[PDB]
Amino acid sequence: DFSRNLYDIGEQLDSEDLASLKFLSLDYIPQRKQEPIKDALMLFQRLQEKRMLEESNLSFLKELLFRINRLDLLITYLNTRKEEMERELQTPGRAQISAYRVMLYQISEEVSRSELRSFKFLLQEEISKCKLDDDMNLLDIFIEMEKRVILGEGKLDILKRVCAQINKSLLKIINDYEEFS
Amino acid sequence: DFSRNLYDIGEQLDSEDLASLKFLSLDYIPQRKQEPIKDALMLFQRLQEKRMLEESNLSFLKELLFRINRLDLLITYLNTRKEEMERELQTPGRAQISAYRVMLYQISEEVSRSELRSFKFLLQEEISKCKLDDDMNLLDIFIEMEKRVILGEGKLDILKRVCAQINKSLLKIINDYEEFS
Amino acid sequence: DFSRNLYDIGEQLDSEDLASLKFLSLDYIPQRKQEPIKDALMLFQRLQEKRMLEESNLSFLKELLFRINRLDLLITYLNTRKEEMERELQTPGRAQISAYRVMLYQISEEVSRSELRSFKFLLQEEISKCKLDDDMNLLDIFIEMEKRVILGEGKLDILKRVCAQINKSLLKIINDYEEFS
Amino acid sequence: DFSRNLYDIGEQLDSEDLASLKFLSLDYIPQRKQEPIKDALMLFQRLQEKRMLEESNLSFLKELLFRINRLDLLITYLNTRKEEMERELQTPGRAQISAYRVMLYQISEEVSRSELRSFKFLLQEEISKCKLDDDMNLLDIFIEMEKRVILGEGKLDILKRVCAQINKSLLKIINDYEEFS
Amino acid sequence: DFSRNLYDIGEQLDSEDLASLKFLSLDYIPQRKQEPIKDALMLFQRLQEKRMLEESNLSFLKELLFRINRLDLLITYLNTRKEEMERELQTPGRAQISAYRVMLYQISEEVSRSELRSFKFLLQEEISKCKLDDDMNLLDIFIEMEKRVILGEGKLDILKRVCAQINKSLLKIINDYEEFS
Amino acid sequence: DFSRNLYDIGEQLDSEDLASLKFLSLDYIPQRKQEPIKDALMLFQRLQEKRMLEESNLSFLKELLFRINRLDLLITYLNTRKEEMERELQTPGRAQISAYRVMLYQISEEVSRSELRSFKFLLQEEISKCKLDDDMNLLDIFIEMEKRVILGEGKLDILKRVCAQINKSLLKIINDYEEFS
Amino acid sequence: DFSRNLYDIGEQLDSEDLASLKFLSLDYIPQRKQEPIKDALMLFQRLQEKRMLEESNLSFLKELLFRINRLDLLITYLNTRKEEMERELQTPGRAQISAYRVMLYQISEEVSRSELRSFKFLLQEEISKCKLDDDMNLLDIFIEMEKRVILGEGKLDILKRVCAQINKSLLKIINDYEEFS
Amino acid sequence: DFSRNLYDIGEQLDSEDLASLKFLSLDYIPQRKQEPIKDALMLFQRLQEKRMLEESNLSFLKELLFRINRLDLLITYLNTRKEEMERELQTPGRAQISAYRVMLYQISEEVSRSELRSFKFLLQEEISKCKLDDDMNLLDIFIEMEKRVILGEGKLDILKRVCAQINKSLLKIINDYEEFS
Amino acid sequence: DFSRNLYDIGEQLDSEDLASLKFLSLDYIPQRKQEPIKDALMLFQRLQEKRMLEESNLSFLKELLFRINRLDLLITYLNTRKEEMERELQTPGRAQISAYRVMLYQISEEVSRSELRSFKFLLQEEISKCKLDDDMNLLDIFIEMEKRVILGEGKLDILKRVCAQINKSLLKIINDYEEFS
């Protein structure tokens, strides 16, 4: 019955937060399969097809909100505290979103608009293969980097070289991924 | 019908006031549902659809104008005196906007753009995830604080932990939490 | 004579108008007799066979045009004033189209495309038995609901729950049918 | 062969031009019989059946291009001076499209897309009978108003009540129509 | 081949001055066909439709470049001496941009940003439907005043109501209307 | 109408006198509404929005101008003597500016521009971490005291503990605390 | 069997990627057999029909995905690395499609949306037969030309008449047709 | 690759130096092309658009740094001595930035802000055609002079007249152009 | 949570102190990246982004206050004695700011505001490249000379040749530079 209230979660979702969910959902939803999604419920439909999100199991949604920092919804509508997802972080295999995706998202939160401009031209300096613009959310840029296979667990060094021209707080985020080695 | 007057109200409504009205609509319009609204008329349409703003019931708009201090509209268009605010504040349930939201507005009401920069210097301690713009409305920041569940009805007294460091006059509004009971 | 003139009058009607007329003809023309209809004249032929629409008695057509707000035809071709449609209220049973169908139609007039997509999700949330698509008109959905016996004067509460997820003006349209209790 | 060679005219005509031509063609082509038209060729076929556009008589097209301000084509392909389009004003009946239509057209050209949104609010101020959409051309709205018989050659000055609120110079365009009384 | 140099002119045209070209084109291209224009070359395409600007006749562009003081482009691309702009003064009707538009432009050139703010305050007193923001331009105000039908060729003197309060030199500019005596 | 003729005040109104008006308007115009005021026109705008400034009642403006002694110009706008401000003393609540704001202003008028230096030293004693910009006149300092809620209507007398060290004439100003009896 | 997975390549391919593949498949699949194609599987089936691409010989697909820079799919589905095509395509006759197609694609990667806008404006001046609109891809333009054999390898440098006014690095691409000698 | 270092060079560029580079780049970058440019690398992207600056040829930037006295970057990061830029004097055409532009730049380096005040007073004495503003950089004024063709290799006597009215030492720069007689 | 205690530093520090910090920060922050900074807390943000200043490592801030002679603040903010700064100086690699920068600062402290005038004359004798202004700090001038590469680690012994001419005791510091090499 709570699908009725899934609606009542999605309406509070920012267009930007949706794009964030799209990026994080890429571990399950194909790069094009995700594209028709225009809101949370569209995502939920895909996740129902993948059986990641359903009335019988909204634990994926629970994490998703934890990952994009929409804890207001986790508590308000899913009626649980963030510490539940922190318990899901306790042991391997309980987290549904990969740590690497989380780190890349954390970057997108750390990187400012001005720095994003640097990211745009700087990546172009790294390769002409990418066609970039001011509409390229860093997360969308990351998707493009995946296409060229210059973004991944074995390409982390590239991100660090990029960070050298941006800031060291990002470099930190990169080093903080060491524990998942 | 009466939307003939709403039009002429909206023409005189400021884009800054509209931003604050979006915050005030949070007790009815979903957190991010109002985000594609560009002018007063679109806002008014949503309120008509939710029947918060009716041709026979303009009392919600009346309050809204009281909340954004537009007395040039209260009398000019709604033909109501300023004293009617206290009339609507006679008993609980009469006001449509929570005193909680009213306080949050007044808290930001006394804030300077230079204090907003100072706030960001303190907000990075509260949550480094908060990617904020130098022209970010404090009310928008409050929405972000909801996301972190660090600002709320019972978490109102979190604000003073950094607001007292910026402008202790805000405390006079925060202490009005007593009007919850 | 004029029955033949209708040949060149029906072309002024939309395909959405036709679909709407099909919904309105649900109290006369069977679903299996509605589907073959491809244009207004096909509809007219069925109504001629059922003697609802004949040159000697076009009072059914007259009402229909009122029901779908095509008064331009009511006056310019059927040569009668829009004010004459009030005669439907002179006595119970005078109207050929039931108020119930009128209400459901008015809803489809009030519901936008974006809201329609929301209705698609909401019904999916209500049950998986109803398979839906992007070409589903709200009136088409109502037909599907009828077939599944979840649409009726005693099922209005379901529509009310769904409308609560959209807007209160739709709820109003439904509540306007309460006077026929 | 020649009229067939004019099939290419549609390659320099815009989709907006076609939409405008459809409105202007309403005096001869049924309100919705025009809709299958996807290009100028399709339009011409309807005009061939209506005998408005013939290989040996393009005077109808000549007027159209003048009315929609595609003078580049009026000269380049139809090889006629724009000055000779004013010959429609020499005696009554020389014009093929009613002055009523070009009046409404000029209005639609004068109104901004942002003002169209403003109109939408005032269109509900007029009535709830008109269902609105973001893709509605003001000419489309005019058609819808005709359907409700609240707009016409005798009801043109109904628009003035709303137009005064958007652009009062439209009132003059309307007032000038009086000269054809 | 100069239509390829129209591109060049457009690149060498100042994006800030393009706004004034739109103002100058008000009596040829409706604000609806102006607002989607992003550069001069797009405007030029509109002027091709009206046949104001073609390779066979760039005299309209010539006049436009005179108004926005781009004499360097008259020489560089139109290959003509600056004095040839004054050929429009030989006989009445030669000019295509009314001195009315020229004077209003000259006013906007004389008015300081600080004086504009003053005019915006005075507009708030003058126009009952005045709406102000940080993107306002005196030329845009003039357009809006036409929409209020308070500014015009015969109503030009209205500007002296506020110009006399600001800068006598602006009033002097207005007095140039005397040439229509 | 006439309101527009009060704009002239700005020509003779010193920016420092405007800053004084800002201090006096602290009980009316919000911080965020006050600080973007760059001239009397922006001030007037805010006053109109709260309908404090209206042709039917300019008494608030009058009182304000009396405080800064610019009501001397009243005889050039309303044609009446500034002495009629004494009417505010007839009964309690007639004055719109609290004697709290008045007394603090009188202090800023009594203290020498060079003596302010000593007040900066006093501020060092009270708060060695406080920023002491040379632009901080006593009125701005008083605002900073409000930011530290050390100064107010009930705290006003606190100033005497350092004012006695500056000049007994300042104590004489402070002795107007008797007006709160 | 395993082909089931290959079918899903299209679930990561974008519509832009597929459109690019269509352009690159112009040396195999006619424009009349490309239109029905809506996804990668459709493309695959067209190629399977004539054994041009089949599960037992994916060497053409290997290049295709390599050429459109989707190396993540070379890994994910083709279970290989870019190195394979880099080595394989070193010598003439190893490519399945003309480098002419590839080079034109590379241009579409280098040309910005903003550059394409002005690129199209030049196309209108360069070829009056063009039917330009917002849905035209740069590659679609090239096809439009081929529809009447007015663009191809024989005039591969024709684009220099447009690129010279846009971006010299596009001229560089043209100057990289050295191996076609 | 190395572009990465050009970025790193650019981070030490002043916004004034950037504007100066824009002026010097006016022999290449279109009048409005540089308007969205907010930092060095953005400019470099426009220089990549023209291929004035490229990893294959950095001599353009190298000269520019010499022109605006940023040898701290030329020597430090581009490993180039100023004498190698001075080596340009061997033969004509070695310089990519005209001595005309360099001369006018040097003037802006010689003229004080206080002399710009007196310049702008004399500018109005010369003509009211210039859209005078307090934020007008002398180089921006030069651009406006170019617009009106009152600045050039044959208009240098205008600046010479102005210089004689400001500072006799300025004449030592503007007269130096005589070497190209 | 430790940066919470940095807030009250920037409030105490002067704009001059900030300017001094900016000069000393040049070894890490680009010559023109710090310019938008309006207070010390904005500086701190940049330092934390570049991780030059960390909550776990405040030793850079510690040094900063030492270098600008604010040792008495170390006990008030970092709770450490000034003697520990000499402890740091005991061994190489502990200091984060170069002695070169520090010594140049000491010079600016020794040079009088009046002497600066005579230095401006000397700077003109040195070169016409450095544009001078009364609002320039000697440290700002130092930066400008560095830009011309006439001031540096190997040119420090050149500048002093005119420094002694104003204050011989400056060289009592400068000549000690030898000890660091």
Short mmCIF file of N, CA and C in Angstrom, two decimals, chain I residues 88-158:
data_model
loop_
_atom_site.label_atom_id
_atom_site.label_comp_id
_atom_site.label_asym_id
_atom_site.label_seq_id
_atom_site.Cartn_x
_atom_site.Cartn_y
_atom_site.Cartn_z
N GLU I 88 59.92 26.19 16.29
CA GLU I 88 59.70 25.81 14.90
C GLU I 88 60.88 26.20 14.02
N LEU I 89 61.40 27.41 14.23
CA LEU I 89 62.52 27.91 13.44
C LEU I 89 63.83 27.18 13.72
N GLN I 90 63.84 26.28 14.71
CA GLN I 90 65.10 25.60 15.04
C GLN I 90 65.60 24.73 13.89
N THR I 91 64.67 24.11 13.16
CA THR I 91 65.03 23.13 12.15
C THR I 91 64.35 23.44 10.82
N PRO I 92 65.07 23.21 9.70
CA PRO I 92 64.54 23.39 8.34
C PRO I 92 63.30 22.55 8.07
N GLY I 93 62.39 23.07 7.25
CA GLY I 93 61.22 22.31 6.86
C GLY I 93 60.01 22.52 7.76
N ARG I 94 60.23 23.11 8.93
CA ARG I 94 59.12 23.42 9.83
C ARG I 94 58.35 24.66 9.40
N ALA I 95 59.06 25.68 8.93
CA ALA I 95 58.43 26.88 8.39
C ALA I 95 57.76 26.59 7.06
N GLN I 96 56.53 27.08 6.89
CA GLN I 96 55.79 26.86 5.66
C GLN I 96 55.90 28.06 4.74
N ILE I 97 56.21 29.22 5.32
CA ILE I 97 56.35 30.44 4.54
C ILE I 97 57.83 30.75 4.38
N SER I 98 58.25 31.07 3.15
CA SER I 98 59.66 31.32 2.86
C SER I 98 60.15 32.57 3.60
N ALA I 99 61.41 32.54 4.03
CA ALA I 99 62.03 33.70 4.65
C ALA I 99 62.04 34.90 3.71
N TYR I 100 62.14 34.63 2.42
CA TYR I 100 62.06 35.66 1.39
C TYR I 100 60.78 36.49 1.53
N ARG I 101 59.64 35.81 1.62
CA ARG I 101 58.36 36.49 1.83
C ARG I 101 58.34 37.24 3.15
N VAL I 102 58.84 36.60 4.20
CA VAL I 102 58.79 37.19 5.54
C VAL I 102 59.60 38.48 5.59
N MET I 103 60.78 38.46 4.99
CA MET I 103 61.68 39.61 5.02
C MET I 103 61.07 40.78 4.25
N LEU I 104 60.44 40.47 3.11
CA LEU I 104 59.77 41.51 2.33
C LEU I 104 58.65 42.17 3.13
N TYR I 105 57.91 41.37 3.89
CA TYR I 105 56.93 41.92 4.81
C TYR I 105 57.58 42.85 5.84
N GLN I 106 58.67 42.40 6.46
CA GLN I 106 59.34 43.21 7.47
C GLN I 106 59.73 44.57 6.88
N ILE I 107 60.15 44.55 5.62
CA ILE I 107 60.50 45.80 4.95
C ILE I 107 59.28 46.71 4.91
N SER I 108 58.13 46.17 4.52
CA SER I 108 56.92 46.99 4.39
C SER I 108 56.49 47.56 5.74
N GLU I 109 56.81 46.85 6.82
CA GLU I 109 56.55 47.34 8.16
C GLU I 109 57.50 48.47 8.54
N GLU I 110 58.75 48.36 8.11
CA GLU I 110 59.74 49.41 8.39
C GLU I 110 59.56 50.69 7.57
N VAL I 111 59.10 50.56 6.33
CA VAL I 111 58.88 51.72 5.47
C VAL I 111 57.64 52.54 5.86
N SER I 112 57.83 53.85 6.00
CA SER I 112 56.75 54.77 6.35
C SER I 112 55.84 55.08 5.15
N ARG I 113 54.57 55.35 5.45
CA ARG I 113 53.57 55.80 4.48
C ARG I 113 53.98 57.03 3.67
N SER I 114 54.80 57.86 4.30
CA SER I 114 55.35 59.05 3.65
C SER I 114 56.53 58.67 2.77
N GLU I 115 57.34 57.74 3.25
CA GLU I 115 58.49 57.27 2.49
C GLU I 115 58.03 56.59 1.20
N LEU I 116 56.87 55.94 1.24
CA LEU I 116 56.33 55.27 0.06
C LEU I 116 56.31 56.22 -1.13
N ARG I 117 56.04 57.50 -0.86
CA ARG I 117 55.99 58.49 -1.93
C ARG I 117 57.34 58.57 -2.65
N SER I 118 58.41 58.60 -1.86
CA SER I 118 59.75 58.71 -2.41
C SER I 118 60.13 57.42 -3.14
N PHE I 119 59.58 56.30 -2.69
CA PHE I 119 59.80 55.02 -3.35
C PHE I 119 59.14 55.02 -4.72
N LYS I 120 57.97 55.64 -4.81
CA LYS I 120 57.31 55.79 -6.11
C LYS I 120 58.19 56.53 -7.11
N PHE I 121 58.85 57.60 -6.67
CA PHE I 121 59.81 58.30 -7.52
C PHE I 121 60.97 57.39 -7.96
N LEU I 122 61.50 56.63 -7.01
CA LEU I 122 62.56 55.67 -7.29
C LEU I 122 62.10 54.58 -8.26
N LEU I 123 60.85 54.15 -8.11
CA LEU I 123 60.31 53.12 -8.99
C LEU I 123 60.21 53.64 -10.42
N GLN I 124 59.85 54.91 -10.57
CA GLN I 124 59.86 55.53 -11.89
C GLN I 124 61.28 55.59 -12.46
N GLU I 125 62.26 55.84 -11.59
CA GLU I 125 63.65 55.84 -12.03
C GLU I 125 64.08 54.43 -12.47
N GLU I 126 63.56 53.42 -11.78
CA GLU I 126 63.83 52.02 -12.11
C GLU I 126 63.20 51.55 -13.42
N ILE I 127 61.94 51.91 -13.65
CA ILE I 127 61.27 51.52 -14.88
C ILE I 127 59.93 52.22 -15.06
N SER I 128 59.47 52.29 -16.31
CA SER I 128 58.12 52.75 -16.61
C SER I 128 57.12 51.60 -16.70
N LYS I 129 57.59 50.37 -16.52
CA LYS I 129 56.71 49.20 -16.61
C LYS I 129 55.71 49.12 -15.47
N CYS I 130 56.16 49.45 -14.26
CA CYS I 130 55.31 49.39 -13.09
C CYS I 130 54.42 50.62 -12.92
N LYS I 131 53.14 50.47 -13.23
CA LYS I 131 52.16 51.53 -13.02
C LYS I 131 51.93 51.72 -11.53
N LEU I 132 51.98 52.97 -11.08
CA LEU I 132 51.92 53.27 -9.65
C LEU I 132 50.60 53.94 -9.25
N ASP I 133 50.21 53.77 -7.99
CA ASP I 133 48.99 54.38 -7.47
C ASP I 133 49.10 54.59 -5.96
N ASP I 134 48.36 55.56 -5.43
CA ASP I 134 48.47 55.89 -4.01
C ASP I 134 47.81 54.84 -3.12
N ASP I 135 47.01 53.97 -3.73
CA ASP I 135 46.31 52.93 -2.98
C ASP I 135 47.09 51.62 -2.95
N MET I 136 48.27 51.63 -3.55
CA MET I 136 49.11 50.44 -3.60
C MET I 136 49.95 50.31 -2.34
N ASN I 137 49.91 49.13 -1.72
CA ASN I 137 50.81 48.84 -0.62
C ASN I 137 52.19 48.55 -1.20
N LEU I 138 53.24 48.82 -0.43
CA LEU I 138 54.58 48.44 -0.86
C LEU I 138 54.67 46.95 -1.20
N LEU I 139 53.91 46.13 -0.49
CA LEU I 139 53.86 44.69 -0.77
C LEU I 139 53.20 44.43 -2.12
N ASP I 140 52.18 45.23 -2.44
CA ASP I 140 51.55 45.19 -3.76
C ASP I 140 52.56 45.56 -4.84
N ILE I 141 53.35 46.59 -4.56
CA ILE I 141 54.41 47.00 -5.47
C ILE I 141 55.43 45.88 -5.66
N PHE I 142 55.81 45.23 -4.56
CA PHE I 142 56.71 44.08 -4.62
C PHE I 142 56.18 43.02 -5.59
N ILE I 143 54.89 42.72 -5.49
CA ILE I 143 54.26 41.77 -6.39
C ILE I 143 54.41 42.21 -7.85
N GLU I 144 54.21 43.50 -8.09
CA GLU I 144 54.27 44.05 -9.44
C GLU I 144 55.68 43.93 -10.03
N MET I 145 56.69 44.15 -9.19
CA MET I 145 58.08 44.03 -9.60
C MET I 145 58.44 42.57 -9.85
N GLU I 146 57.82 41.67 -9.09
CA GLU I 146 58.00 40.24 -9.32
C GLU I 146 57.44 39.86 -10.69
N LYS I 147 56.31 40.47 -11.04
CA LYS I 147 55.66 40.22 -12.32
C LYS I 147 56.58 40.59 -13.47
N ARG I 148 57.37 41.64 -13.26
CA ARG I 148 58.36 42.06 -14.25
C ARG I 148 59.68 41.31 -14.07
N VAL I 149 59.70 40.38 -13.12
CA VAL I 149 60.90 39.63 -12.73
C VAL I 149 62.11 40.56 -12.52
N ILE I 150 61.88 41.67 -11.82
CA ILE I 150 62.98 42.53 -11.37
C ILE I 150 63.09 42.47 -9.85
N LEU I 151 62.21 41.69 -9.24
CA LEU I 151 62.31 41.37 -7.82
C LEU I 151 62.15 39.87 -7.61
N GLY I 152 63.07 39.28 -6.85
CA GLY I 152 63.09 37.85 -6.63
C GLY I 152 64.22 37.44 -5.72
N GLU I 153 64.35 36.14 -5.50
CA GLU I 153 65.37 35.58 -4.61
C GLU I 153 66.78 35.98 -5.04
N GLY I 154 66.96 36.24 -6.33
CA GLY I 154 68.25 36.65 -6.85
C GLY I 154 68.29 38.11 -7.24
N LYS I 155 67.17 38.80 -7.03
CA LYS I 155 67.08 40.22 -7.36
C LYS I 155 66.83 41.05 -6.12
N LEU I 156 66.64 40.36 -5.00
CA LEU I 156 66.54 41.01 -3.70
C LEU I 156 67.71 41.94 -3.43
N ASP I 157 68.90 41.55 -3.89
CA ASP I 157 70.10 42.35 -3.73
C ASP I 157 70.23 43.46 -4.77
N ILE I 158 69.22 43.60 -5.61
CA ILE I 158 69.19 44.68 -6.58
C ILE I 158 68.26 45.79 -6.10
#
